[PDB]
Amino acid sequence: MVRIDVISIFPAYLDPIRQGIVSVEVHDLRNWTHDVHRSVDDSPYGGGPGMVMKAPVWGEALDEICSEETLLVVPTPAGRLFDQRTAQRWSTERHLVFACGRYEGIDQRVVDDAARRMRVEEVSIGDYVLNGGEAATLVMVEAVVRLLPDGLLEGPSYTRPPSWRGLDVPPVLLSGDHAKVAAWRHEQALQRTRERRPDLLD
Amino acid sequence: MVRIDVISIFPAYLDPIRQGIVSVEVHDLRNWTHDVHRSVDDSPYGGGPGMVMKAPVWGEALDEICSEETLLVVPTPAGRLFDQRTAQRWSTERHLVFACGRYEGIDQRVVDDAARRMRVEEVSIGDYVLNGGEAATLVMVEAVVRLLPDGLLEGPSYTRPPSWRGLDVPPVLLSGDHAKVAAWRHEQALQRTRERRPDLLD
Ligand SMILES: Nc1ncnc2c1ncn2[C@@H]1O[C@H](CSCC[C@H](N)C(=O)O)[C@@H](O)[C@H]1O
Ligand SMILES: Nc1ncnc2c1ncn2[C@@H]1O[C@H](CSCC[C@H](N)C(=O)O)[C@@H](O)[C@H]1O
Numbered sequence: 001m002v003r004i005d006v007i008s009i010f011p012a013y014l015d016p017i018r019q020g021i022v023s024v025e026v027h028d029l030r031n032w033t034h035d036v037h038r039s040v041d042d043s044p045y046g047g048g049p050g051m052v053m054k055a056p057v058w059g060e061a062l063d064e065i066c067s068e069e070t071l072l073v074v075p076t077p078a079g080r081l082f083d084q085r086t087a088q089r090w091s092t093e094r095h096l097v098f099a100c101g102r103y104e105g106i107d108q109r110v111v112d113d114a115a116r117r118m119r120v121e122e123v124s125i126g127d128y129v130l131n132g133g134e135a136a137t138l139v140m141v142e143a144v145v146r147l148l149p150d151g152l153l154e155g156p157s158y159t160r161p162p163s164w165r166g167l168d169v170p171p172v173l174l175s176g177d178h179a180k181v182a183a184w185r186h187e188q189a190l191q192r193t194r195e196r197r198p199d200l201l202d
Numbered sequence: 203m204v205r206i207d208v209i210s211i212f213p214a215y216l217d218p219i220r221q222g223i224v225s226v227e228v229h230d231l232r233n234w235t236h237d238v239h240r241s242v243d244d245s246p247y248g249g250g251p252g253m254v255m256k257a258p259v260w261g262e263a264l265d266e267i268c269s270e271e272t273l274l275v276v277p278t279p280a281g282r283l284f285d286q287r288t289a290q291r292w293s294t295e296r297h298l299v300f301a302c303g304r305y306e307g308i309d310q311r312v313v314d315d316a317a318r319r320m321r322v323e324e325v326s327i328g329d330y331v332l333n334g335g336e337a338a339t340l341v342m343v344e345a346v347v348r349l350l351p352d353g354l355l356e357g358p359s360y361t362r363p364p365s366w367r368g369l370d371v372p373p374v375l376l377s378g379d380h381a382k383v384a385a386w387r388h389e390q391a392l393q394r395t396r397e398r399r400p401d402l403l404d
Contacts, residue, residue: 016215016336042361046375046383052361059367078355080398084330108358109369122398126328128286128345134218135341142337143330153280156310159244159254165261167311173248181248196282196324 002093002148005065006137007058008100009040013134017141021148024141032061041103050104058099058110070095072120073140075133076105079122082136086123087143098140100133153197155188204295204350207267208339209260210302211242215336219343223350226343234263243305252306260301260312272297274322275342277335278307281324284338288325289345300342302335355399357390 004024006014014026030038041051066072071093080086090096099106114120125136158169172184193200206226208216216228232240243253268274273295282288292298301308316322327338360371374386395402 010221013218013221015217016340019212019215045360045362045364045371046378046387047380048359052359054361055366056363078357078394078398082328082330087330104359105356107361107366109360109366109371112369113367125330125341126284128284128289128327128341129348130341130344131348135337135344138218138340139327139330139332139337142332146331146333154307155280157250157254157306158247158311159256159309160247161258162247164257164309164311165315167314169247169311176248178249185248192280196280 002091002144003095004098004141004145005096006098006100006134006141007061007065008132008134008137009102010100010132010134013132014137016138022145027061027065029057029061032057032064044104048104052104053101053106053110055107055109055113058106059113062097062099062110062114066097066114066118067095068118070097070118072097072099072111072114072118073137074099074101074106074111074120074122075125075136075140076101076122077124077127077129078105079124082123082125082140082143084143086121087140088147090140090144091147096141096144098133098137100137102132151200152186152189153193153200155185155192204293204346205297206300206343206347207298208300208302208336208343209263209267210334210336210339211304212302212334212336215334216339218340224347229263229267231259231263234259234266246306250306254306255303255308255312257309257311257315260308261315264299264301264312264316268299268316268320269297270320272299272320274299274301274313274316274320275339276301276303276308276313276322276324277327277338277342278303278324279326279329279331280307281326284325284327284342284345286345288323289342290349292342292346293349298343298346300335300339302339304334353402354388354391355395355402357387357394 006026011026011028044052162169208228213228213230246254364371
């Protein structure tokens with residue numbers, strides 16, 4: 001079984017995450033604060049464009065939630081790119097903890113302290129900016145959980161009816177020789193990949 | 203104002219999307235079915251590993267929801283990569299419709315028919331596989347809405363206290379000359395980018 005914990009100051013954003021193999025629990029980071037303000041952020045050392053999430057609150061939360069078996073994931077635009085191989089690799093883990101940042105991110109010493117006792121991966125889901133780690137956590141959790149018990153883009157798929165609004169299903173798919181269908185699909189996959197993702201051809 | 207419509211067979215997955223500039227409405231695709239089964243999928247022409255979403259249900263839904271001003275987004279792993287420039291560009295639109303696929307995706311003629319009357323972008327959020335377009339829609343909507351009224355990864359940030367669990371904030375950030383802080387941050391950004399995203403240096 002894989003146990004998944006998510007820590008966030010917007011726990012309700014993880015509501016879709018529910019939709020004996022996997023367990024999910026979402027925690028409010030403000031539960032490990034001790035001040036009337038329930039403060040989780042503070043001013044950046046060196047100056048900066050926003051606030052930074054405090055280390056003591058995070059360390060206290062991670063002390064309670066994680067153990068030596070934990071793989072701690074920190075969603076961040078400064079991370080390694082999430083990919084299918086990463087999702088497969090994480091699917092074998094027994095305990096994933098997703099630490100969701102907001103503001104400008106989490107004080108670096110949270111990760112440095114955690115790495116003393118567990119494994120930690122900082123991961124971006126793509127080259128675009130979100131407000132927080134929660135949506136990235138939804139994507140990574142879904143990608144992983146769907147893996148529990150070539151290199152061309154996929155081309156177009158069709159289903160019935162054979163004609164719809166003057167647009168016909170390509171005849172080779174209707175008149176089906178397996179070899180001809182595969183050939184047609186490979187050509188479509190290659191053209192699509194050239195058009196949309198030339199990086200995948202180098 | 204930007205009006206955002208999402209169409210999905212799992213409308214509840216778009217619940218976080220709520221958290222005079224932007225309007226969001228989620229629709230159940232099965233509302234445009236007419237059979238007792240509320241069927242939205244059918245067998246792939248040419249053979250295939252799964253079912254394909256029917257065109258007539260989608261065209262009927264898109265007839266009701268879209269107009270000539272609409273930019274229709276189809277989340278798909280076969281799409282162009284979503285990026286920050288795309289999110290900025292979409293933030294200027296007046297009407298975004300997100301067509302969420304499941305199973306093996308949507309019959310290609312849905313996109314071909316829609317492109318007769320509107321603009322259509324097929325977009326992937328990254329090189330990993332989800333079950334459906336709904337989580338990708340959460341990411342793209344968040345990236346866009348946060349834009350409404352260099353090229354190195356960001357390095358580490360710190361906030362108080364200056365020492366925590368034997369880990370000190372780097373002294374240059376505490377003893378702050380603006381030029382020295384910027385220099386230190388540029389070096390950290392460069393090393394981090396080399397380590398985690400060498401593709402960004404080519
Ligand atoms: N592409 C991405 N992948 C993973 N997490 C991301 C992400 N984009 C943003 N995040 C999450 O969002 C948090 C804040 S990033 C946004 C910072 C702030 N709004 C600003 O002025 O830019 C990060 O710490 C990370 O947890
Ligand atoms: N990286 C990505 N970016 C955008 N949409 C994606 C995506 N990965 C999956 N999707 C969405 O998920 C839908 C089904 S893809 C999964 C297909 C099926 N479960 C299988 O056997 O592989 C796509 O049509 C698209 O809407």
